[PDB]
Every structure is written in C-alpha cells, then in structure tokens.
DNA sequence: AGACCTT
DNA sequence: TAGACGCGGACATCAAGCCCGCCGTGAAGGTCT
C-alpha cells in the first residue's frame, strides 16, 4: 500500500485578521504599531556561567550591571478608543471526497468508498460542530482574550435567508458544548456546513465579526515574521490599510486555531493541531509517535478493514471510530500523503 | 582580466579565492602558468611545498566532480533534490525577452554534497588559457593538448596516471538525468493547443544567478536580499556569496493613481479579488508582482469549473487590474518530517517573499448569454500563486456581463487602479532593464513564459501522466496604462500562443 | 535537579503607560506638551582640561575655558493657571507561573509545577501579593514627580467589583507604613481578588488606577527619555490628535516589581531579577560566587520540596520568595 | 550510525 | 460706462556646538562509509 504519489487539498480555508480602532462618535481607523527601542539587563545563563559551574571570571560584578539595548515593536489601543474589532472570513468546500493525485486504481476507489461509508453511518454532525465550536468562540483571536473585559462574535452566512447570527458575551454565557447548541440558529449552521462536505461541488462562507473591550492603553498581540540572519527582535507581519501600516495576525496561523480539534490521543487532556506525527508545539513531544501505532500512516494502511467494519451493525466506536474521526480530519486538512518522497 | 596585477598588490591570501569561485570575472593564465596551476592542485583541502596531492589516488576522488557540474541547478530553492541537468537553452529567443540565450554559458559549478566542495577544485574553475574561456577538465580528456608537460613540471606524475586521464573523461557534456518520482522537483501543466496539454517543471540557470548577483552589489534600491540556511549543500555558487543572493527588487513602493479619466461581445467582470499571503519570488531571480503564467492558471482553472456544466465556455483572454500591491518577508514554516536518521524535526530554513494583490479581471469570452447569478460564485477557484482568493458578499452584487468593452471598466466601483502590458523594447542584458528602471521607477519585472530543454518525451510518473519538459523563465517588464479615450485593448488582453519552444505570455497586439 | 535547554514563562503582572493631562478650574481636560529649547553652558567636563592619566593640557587656556556649549534640550512644564496634574494606566494580574509555557522536558515541569502547589498551601500569597499592591498605591510608578510636590492622591477602580471606587488620600502623612493602609474601609476585600488570580487557574482580576499631582507654580515635569546632537529626547505618543509624553511602559513594570529586600545586605528594595542588580551603585549583590542568584536556588528545587512537608526557618522562605517573584517576571530560563 | 562541511 | 496703479538707496559684525557605556539566547542537514 502507500503508492509512490498521492495527494488531497484543503477543504477549509480562512484569511487574514485585520484590525481597525472604533471610536466613540462612530467612527473607525486602523490599528497602528511603531517601533522601540529599550534597555534591558544582563540576565541570560551563559553569560555567567559558562559550563555545568564554573562562572566565568571576566564576568564580574561590575561586567554584570551593565545595560543592553535591544529593538522591538510595539502596539496598542489608543487613549479615548471605544473597542476593537476585528474583521475575518472562513470558507467550506467539499475537496476530501476525490484525490488530486493518482496513479493507484486499488487505492483510489478504496479512499472514495471509505468517505461514502463514513458519510450515510455515522454522519458528518461530530466534525462540523467541532469545526463551528472552534470558530464561534473566540480562538482565532489566540491571546487577545486574555485579560479582556468581553467580547462578541456575529457571524454572516452565506448562502442564507435571515438575520445575521450572533453570539454575545461568551466567558459568562457560551461556555460549554450545551449553550451553544441552545441557539436559534445552531441546526442551521451546522447542516449547511454538512451540506458543503457532503455535496459534489458544495460550498458554504461565513463571515466572522469580533467586537473586543480591553482596558486602558492595553497591548495588542499580532503574528511575527520567520526571517533567518540593535538586532531587532518582535518584528510583525503587517499589510497596508488605507495607505497605512496595520498588523495582521496570520493567516495560516487562523488555519491552526480552527483545526485544534484532535483528542483522541493516548491521554487526551488538551486538543492538538490535526497533524499525522501530532506534535505539541509548546513541548517538543510528539502524541502518536510513530512507535505507538497510531500515526496517520498506521491508520491509512488499514483502509480497507475499516471497510469491513462499517458494514456490520455492530459498531463498536469506543476507540475504532476515533481512529476514523482522526482519519477524516487528516483528509479535510491534509493532502502529501507519500511515503519515501515528497 | 587581472592576472599579474591582483596577483601581487600585497593584499591577502583569499583574494585568488575570490577569483576563481565563478561569482566573479574571470581572469586568463596566459603568462605565469606554473604558479596558478600549482594553487588549483592545492585547493582540496582547507605553492610546491603542501605536496602529496598529486600522484595518489587523490585522483579517484578529483574524477567524480566532473560527472556532477550542473548547467542548471536542481536544488534550488529546497535540498533535498537528485539531479544532474547540463543542456543549453535549445533554441532561441525574441528582442524583449530576457533569458539565459541572451547571455552565455560558462559559469556552471559542482552541487551534490558537502564533502567534495573543496575536491572539485583543479577540474570545475575556468581559467582563459589564451582565446577560448574555458575550464580546465573540459580540455585535459585528449592527448595533443598544451600545459600539459606543465604536468610534468611536477616530477611526480608517472605515465600511467596519465593512460587513465586519456579514457576516463571521454562523453559526458549533453546530459539530463532527472527522476519524477520519488522525487522533490516542482512540476507542473498548460495548454499547447484546445486539444492536449504539457507538463514541464521550472529549473535554476546559475549563469542568470551570477549574473544578477556581481553587477547588483552597489544598488540598493533595486535589489533585496534573500538568505538560505545550508549553503554548502546547495552548492558552491551559494556558498561563495553564502547565503545572500540579490535579487531584483520591485524597484519603488506601489503607486495609485486615478484609474480611468473617461466622460460579439461577452465581458465578464470579477470585482476586487482579495488575496492573503501569494509568493512574490516568481522566478529565480526576480521579487516583486507574481508570474502572470499563474494569473493564466487562475483563469484557465476558473473556465473548466463551468465546463462542468456548459462545455462552451473558452475564455480565450483575460484582463489584469492591479488596484493595491504590497511584498514583504513573512517567513513560512514547514511542519515536522521524518528526517532519516531516528528523529522528527522540521526541515531546513529559508526566507520567503509574500505578496498581497487586490485585482479585478475583465474576460472576453466567446459565450454569448447570460451565464447565471449563483454557479458563477460556486466555480470560482481558492488560490491565487500559493495564496487565497475570497471576495466579499456584499460584491456579488456588482458581478455582470456586458457586450461592449468601454462600459465594461465603468463597472468596476473603486477608481484607484491600474492596468498591465508588456515592454516591447530590447533586454539583451541587466544593464538594459535597470536603465529603463531608473528613467521610470514605477515598471514591474515578472516570469512571462517558459522555455524549454525538450522536444518533449513521454516520462512514466509525469504529472497527469501527459508528456514532460524541462523549462527556463522568462524576464519581461510590465507598463502603466490609464486607458483615457485611445488606447486600443489589444496592449491589454493577453494569451498563450506557443511558439514551438517557448510558450510566452503577451498581449494580442505583437 | 538540572534544568533543560528550552524553558520559558510568560508575565503575571501587565501594565501599560502613563500618559498626563493638564486639568483647568474650569473642569476641563487637555494633554501636556513639551517643547524642545537650546542653551548655553560652561567649559565644565574634566576631559576637556586635562589629559588621561596626567596633568593639565596646554591648550585649555584661561581665554579657552570661559567660551559657550551650546547644546538642545526638550523641556515639560506645568501651563501657568491649571489647577492639577492628571495620570491614568491600568494593570492586569493573571495566573501565568502555575505551569510553564515552553518546557521539552517532562521531568521538571513536574518539579516546577509541584513547587508552586506547595507554595500556595503552606505559605500563602498574603506576603507577596501585599507588596506588588503597596507600590501601586502609594506613586511609586510616578518616580520623581512626588518629589517636591504638595500632595497627590490615588484613586483605582477593580474588575471585577461591586461596589464604590477605592481611593487613597494625603500620601505623605497618612499612608506611609504597612499598618496604614491595613486601617482601611477596603483593603481586605482587594488583597482576596490579587490572591484569588493567582492560586485559581483562569483567574483574572484588572485594576485601572488614576491619580492627581498638586505642583507649584509652573514647576517641571519629568518623563521617560529615549535610548540612542539633540541630548534629552523624550518619550511621545499622539493623545486626541497632539503630541505628549509618556512615562513608558517597561518602566511603569519596573516600578511595581521593587520588591526584593531579602539580598545578603538588605538596606533598599530592589528590582527583582535574576542576578539583581543595581543601578545606584553599578555593582551587583547577589553574585553568582554568593550562591544566591536565581540559577543556583532553581538548580536546588529538589531540596525545597522536602522542607515544606514544620515551619521552615527564615531564609529557605527569603529564598523562596525570590525564587516565586522571578516566576512571576519569567524570563526564558534556558542554558545550553 | 557518523564523518564530512564554508562565507 | 472710459481711463491711469511712480522713482531711489543701503539688508552689520562675532564667538562656541562637552561627554559616558552597553548591543542576550534555544530549535530546524544531505550523503557515502
């Protein structure tokens, strides 16, 4: 099995977070950042000691107290500014059902049978309420949550016939599985997102709208750039709004906040970015290790067992459709699926 | 050409290191021979006294570097990349197109692995004997050859280390060896004709990579440095001026003006495309506006979606309407392989270049009624050069078709843009670009087309399994128009005419 | 105990800039701002009339000295007729040193968690967390703006809260020791909502404090400078469409965490961190040779955990106060 | 598995 | 409703523009033996 090429692509797709000031008499600019420089202190571990002990005698006590100037980047709310908010798009398609590569007939009908069987037994109302939960709570913002007095999303469908849907004071209200299924309009949202996945050429688009209350000049954390070399540290990634500077906050960082949905790891505390090794990126671990047998290619090998299993009605899913909920995940998002190369 | 001159000025040692590394003129080792052949001998390792490198089985590892020297660079821009492609540019190219045809071939270099970077000296320089710039293993494989008995200056050669320098290098100079699969190598596929398709992957010429490089190292507002993170795995052309690599930057920041200044059929429109984090390195040399073959790909991609439905569609043309641009270093991060010893780490690092393009499209298509509201939202592709491409809601409202091109440009609601042709002016050089870039500061360079190394031939793992090339980029320079009352569109409308060996994006009008 | 080479934790204690206003008698409010004027002074540097390690230059004549520097200054004083000065940030407290943030080793985030756990249940917060709430009200975020000056007065606001405004008034007779602010209507009820964000996990509790400044007649206000001839450059950002000063950020932060009097000689609170050092004098006590820096307290974890498991003495509790207070700040604690 | 590896 | 809007002459000299010190660290190799 494995054959020597095969590939899917992506079937959720988000944007940018561009973020623009309100202010009281209603009016709106964009969020700007200028740069800082700053003095610091001595305090990195090799700098007295050099090796296991043994502080280093021309570092002295003296040597020590000196000052070091470093360079950042600095941002954040304006005085007399009424919140920010934070415009977003999200998009759904139905690419997981045919491969973009070939070249293998027997893995080829097999992979489109497993979606098929997958989609009328045990249908798709678990992924697309995880995928909706992820979006409608505010995770997408990463850390600008945090130390916040409220915050609000509303959210455009599309294609839709009503009023727009939104969800209100979210750390107080929405804070578990229940509350957001006890809305007028959450079976709505959930079966046109099941509509995208499982129609030939289906396609569904919200449009997600925070609104952020912060307290008094507070910081503002957006993305950094991956550029490899008063040594400037905390540069942002930036676009240009109206003919100004403004931070962005990602946009494959948005694509790893919606996907933090995988738990049905060996221990299972805490979600994880879907991933075939998945790795935790605040440890340097990897959850299904390719040594405990439950990386995404010691499930893909067997395709066809998870045929013959389907088809009884004896299912037993206590770890045998966790292993096809993993499965599918890997589809919506994943698509080099290749071996010895590529 | 500085020979004796840079030879003795008392500076340092590295100054001949610098010279022969191909990042550099040349120079020609006419009058002192001795002394220069006695330095490319002792260059293995890191004048007639660190002797033993001679008459040895040192030779067994001198022969090997031959084999791999690399006209075009399979490497770039990621490591992990078997190849060997040494072939020139077959054919030729038109006035105002830049390629490596209009510069020629003599700087190619040795990129397989780290060990033999410094044993593929004495065969892999080029010195300039006395006409001919030549190299030095490329004329040492017959037996009637001059500065050879400069061989047996050094009293150490026997006679049967020569009847092996006789037959070991005998054919090598005309071939390509590329594997698909299992394979790193980009590839991809376009139209010849309505009727078939060609795939064909993009290399790296290392003579259009030192060329760029040692005559933009003293302007800095043309030029924009992009590093990589393994440089000796890339090869010695990347090593030499490790990591830095200038290449061509955009030349000013973006520029709006007023769009238009105004008072068949089948004008389709598509208002202000958002894009999120497109690639800006379109060739291998240039940084700025992406390739407009992959502006062709958006369209092409976009007329199969609806001939899913109706199989008459045949777009034909397409209109480029650039309304914001903006090119920085965002850096992209790979996620965790498995590497090959016993970890899972990521892969190597590099810098990146991305992009941010608001555009809107006119296509002239043949389709003579009305195409629909709903479906023409739903075959819409998502990528755009690597990127994304979302709309709005609230635009489809301003998505219509018209019969008449001059209220076609009325319907677009923005009124800061833009539009695109071609330079038709001669690029026979660098020189000739950064000349008109400096008269104008607002003219954009891009890869208009390819160029092929093939006839082509039927390759097994080819990608749609159609038939498989090996091709080049093409420069070219891209113009300002305002459209006022009398600028005919065929300067806009651009499409894809293959010209038998080179498939070049331009305009109708030439 | 040995400690791994990727470690890191983030704040617990965020706060933000001060930025000042001019209050009128008629009850209004506009910025401060400044202004950037040149002098003239002497011949007045030791470096300009004698030579290195010698003896008066022969150039410095008696014509040569009595010349003019000339040099460009910025200046920031109070307008003539205000009434007072006015001052607003806001400082948030989380729970960020429970657990770290970047660890690669499972073997002491153990450690580190399992020292925190212990810490809240044998000697609770009621030490530190009296200290961090001490500097912020008494103006100690203001640093020479008190000095020769009438009489300021604090206000703060909590989240979240029930209730009226705290307020604090006269510091300089009335709120001097750790007694007098524990006389108070309101000083319970604020020290449970610092400790209850730190040993709760998504604990959070904001403060957003304003003062007012009662100076004499267009006496001078000093604000933060920058690092970098224009000598004394200050520190700007634009406040309803001018230009004013700041008093920065950073140095609002380390103004809130002088807390560290425990060091070997134990004279002034100092600003925690990791070798503590001092800029009155540029030397630093608490050396890595007196063993009492924090890579030699943190590199003894193991030992602390069994002490805490009768009452520990008093400077293995002085050692781990600095060892919490640096966790607090956290500071990428890496090595090799 | 590890030894090689330059501006 | 018809018109016109002045000549003639100088824009001073003089000195000067200080020093102090610093510029953090962890992670990401292909290839032959």
Redesign the pocket.
């Known amino acids: 099995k494995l054959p020597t090429n095969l590939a899917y692509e992506r079937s959720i797709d988000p944007s940018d977070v561009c973020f623009f000031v309100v202010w009281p008499d209603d009016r709106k600019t964009p969020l700007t950042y200028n740069s800082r420089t700053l003095?610091?202190?001595?305090?990195?571990?090799?700098?007295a000691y050099d090796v296991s002990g043994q502080p280093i005698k021309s570092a002295t006590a003296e040597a020590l107290a000196?000052?070091?100037?470093?360079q950042?980047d600095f941002c954040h709310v304006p005085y007399g500014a009424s919140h920010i908010e934070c415009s977003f798009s999200v998009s759904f398609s139905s690419e997981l059902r045919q491969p973009y590569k070939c070249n293998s007939s027997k893995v080829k009908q097999t992979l489109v049978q497993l979606v098929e069987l997958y989609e009328t037994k045990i249908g798709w109302t678990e992924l697309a309420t995880r995928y909706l939960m992820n979006i409608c709570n505010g995770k997408w913002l990463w850390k600008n949550t945090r130390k916040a007095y409220c915050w609000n999303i509303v959210l455009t469908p599309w294609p839709w016939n009503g009023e727009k849907v939104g969800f209100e004071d979210i750390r107080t209200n929405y804070t578990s599985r229940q509350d957001f299924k006890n809305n007028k309009n959450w079976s709505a949202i959930v079966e046109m997102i099941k509509t995208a996945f499982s129609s030939t050429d289906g396609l569904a688009i919200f449009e997600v709208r925070a609104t952020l209350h912060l307290p008094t000049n507070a910081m503002v954390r957006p993305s950094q750039v991956?550029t490899?070399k008063?040594?400037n540290?905390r540069v942002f990634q930036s676009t240009t709004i109206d003919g100004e500077r403004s931070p962005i906050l990602g946009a494959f960082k948005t694509g790893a906040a919606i996907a933090t949905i995988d738990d049905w790891y060996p221990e299972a505390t805490e979600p994880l970015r879907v991933g075939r090794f998945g790795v935790h990126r605040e440890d340097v671990t990897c959850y299904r290790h390719p040594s405990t047998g439950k990386d995404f290619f010691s499930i893909l090998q067997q395709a066809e067992h998870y045929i013959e299993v389907l088809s009884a009605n004896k299912t037993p899913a206590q770890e045998t459709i966790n292993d096809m909920h993993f499965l599918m995940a890997n589809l919506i998002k994943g698509g080099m699926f290749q071996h010895k190369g590529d | 050409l500085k020979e004796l001159i840079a030879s003795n000025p008392d500076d340092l040692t590295?100054e001949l290191?610098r010279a022969f590394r191909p990042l550099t003129p040349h120079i020609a080792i006419d009058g002192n021979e001795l002394d220069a052949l006695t330095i490319l001998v002792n260059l293995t390792?890191?004048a007639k006294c660190k002797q033993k490198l001679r008459d040895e089985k040192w030779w067994a590892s001198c022969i090997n570097c031959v084999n791999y020297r690399q006209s075009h660079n399979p490497k770039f821009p990621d490591?992990?990349?078997?190849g060997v492609i040494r072939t020139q540019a077959l054919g030729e190219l038109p006035s105002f197109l830049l390629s490596s045809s209009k510069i020629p071939p003599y700087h190619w270099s040795y990129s397989?692995?780290?060990?033999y970077?410094?044993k593929s000296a004495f065969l892999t320089n080029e010195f300039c004997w006395d006409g001919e710039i030549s190299c030095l293993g490329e004329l040492l494989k017959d037996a009637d050859h001059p500065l050879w008995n400069t061989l047996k200056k050094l009293g150490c050669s026997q006679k049967t280390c020569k009847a092996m320098a006789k037959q070991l290098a005998d054919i090598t100079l005309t071939t390509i060896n590329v594997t698909l699969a299992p394979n790193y190598l980009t590839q991809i596929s376009l139209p010849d004709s309505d009727t078939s398709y060609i795939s064909l992957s993009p290399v790296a010429s290392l003579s259009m990579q030192s060329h760029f490089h040692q005559r933009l190292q003293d302007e800095n507002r043309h030029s924009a440095i992009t590093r990589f993170?393994?440089?000796?795995?890339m090869g010695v052309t990347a090593?030499?001026?490790?990591?830095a690599f200038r290449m061509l930057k955009s030349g000013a920041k973006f520029s709006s003006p007023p769009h238009h200044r105004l008072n068949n059929g089948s004008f389709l429109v598509l208002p202000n495309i958002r894009v999120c984090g497109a690639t800006a390195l379109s060739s291998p040399v240039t940084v700025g506006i992406p390739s407009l073959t992959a502006f062709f790909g958006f369209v092409h991609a976009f007329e199969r979606n609806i001939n899913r439905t109706t199989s008459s569609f045949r777009v034909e043309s397409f209109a480029i309407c650039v309304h914001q641009l903006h090119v920085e270093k965002r850096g992209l991060?790979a996620e965790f392989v498995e590497?090959?010893?016993?970890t899972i780490?990521?892969?190597?690092?590099r810098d990146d270049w991305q992009c941010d393009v608001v555009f809107s499209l006119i296509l002239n298509t043949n389709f003579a009624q009305h195409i629909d509201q709903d479906t023409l939202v739903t075959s819409l592709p998502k990528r755009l050069a690597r990127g994304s491409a979302k709309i709005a809601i609230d635009d489809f409202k301003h998505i219509n078709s018209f019969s008449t091109l001059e209220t076609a440009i009325e319907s677009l609601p923005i009124e800061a843009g833009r539009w695109l042709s071609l330079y038709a002016q001669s690029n026979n050089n660098l020189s000739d670009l950064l000349a008109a870039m400096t008269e104008d500061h607002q003219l954009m360079a891009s890869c208009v087309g390819y160029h092929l190394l093939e006839e082509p031939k039927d390759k097994p793992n080819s990608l749609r399994g159609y038939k498989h090339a090996i091709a080049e980029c093409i420069i070219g320079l891209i113009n300002s128009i305002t459209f006022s009352s009398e600028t005919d569109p065929n300067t806009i409308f651009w499409s894809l005419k293959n010209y038998q060996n080179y498939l070049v994006v331009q305009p109708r009008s030439i």
Do not use: W, Y
């Open positions: 003095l610091g202190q001595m305090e990195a571990a090799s700098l000196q000052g070091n100037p470093h950042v991956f490899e008063t040594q540290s | 590295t290191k390792d890191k490591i992990r990349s078997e397989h692995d780290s060990k970077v410094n993170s393994r440089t000796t795995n090593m030499t001026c490790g990591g991060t590497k090959g010893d016993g780490s990521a892969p190597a690092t």
